[PDB]
């Protein structure tokens, strides 16, 4: 099955940070990477100097259960963030979001799919635009019709 996922963080350097997480994702057990968009920079809200965030989407071809790959990137959030070290909801962070499984749409409480927002994330679409042009969702939209219709934030890449 494939399995597309959001990378993005603020975290230090963020070049190695996802990194990192790319390397975290193919040894996740009954799966590997198939495809990695571009990286790309979206950069923070006001004048104040923080650091700009790097997005990026991924293609994992597995054979777990979706609840079972949550539980994988859930761990790999904790392992490679600042949960610890810092807060939950810190000011910079790791986050790693299960978008798309397969054609699968799973509404529950620990796990929506596809992704409650991104159809509404320019940092989450363009990457994975660049990975999968001809994507259709469950509900039989077209990512390529979604992109010529919503507004987006320009998005550059890193
Ligand atoms: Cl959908």
């Given at each position: 099955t494939v399995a597309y996922i959001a990378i993005g963080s603020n975290l230090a350097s963020p070049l190695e940070q996802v990194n990192a997480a790319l390397k975290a994702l193919g040894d996740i057990p009954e799966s590997h990477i198939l495809t990695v968009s571009s990286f790309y920079r979206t950069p923070p809200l006001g004048p104040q100097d923080q650091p700009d965030y790097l997005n990026a989407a991924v293609a994992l071809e597995t054979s777990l259960a979706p609840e079972e790959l949550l539980n994988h990137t859930q761990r790999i959030e904790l392992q490679q963030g600042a949960v610890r070290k810092a807060?939950?909801?810190?000011?910079r962070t790791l986050d790693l979001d299960i978008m798309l499984f397969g054609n699968e749409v799973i509404n529950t409480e620990r796990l929506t799919v596809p992704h409650y927002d991104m159809k509404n994330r320019g940092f989450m679409l363009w990457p994975l635009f660049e990975i999968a042009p001809e994507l259709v969702f469950?509900?039989?939209?077209?990512l390529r019709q979604i992109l010529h219709t919503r507004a987006f934030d320009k998005l550059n890449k890193w």
């Open positions: 807060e939950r909801w810190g000011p469950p509900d039989g939209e077209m």
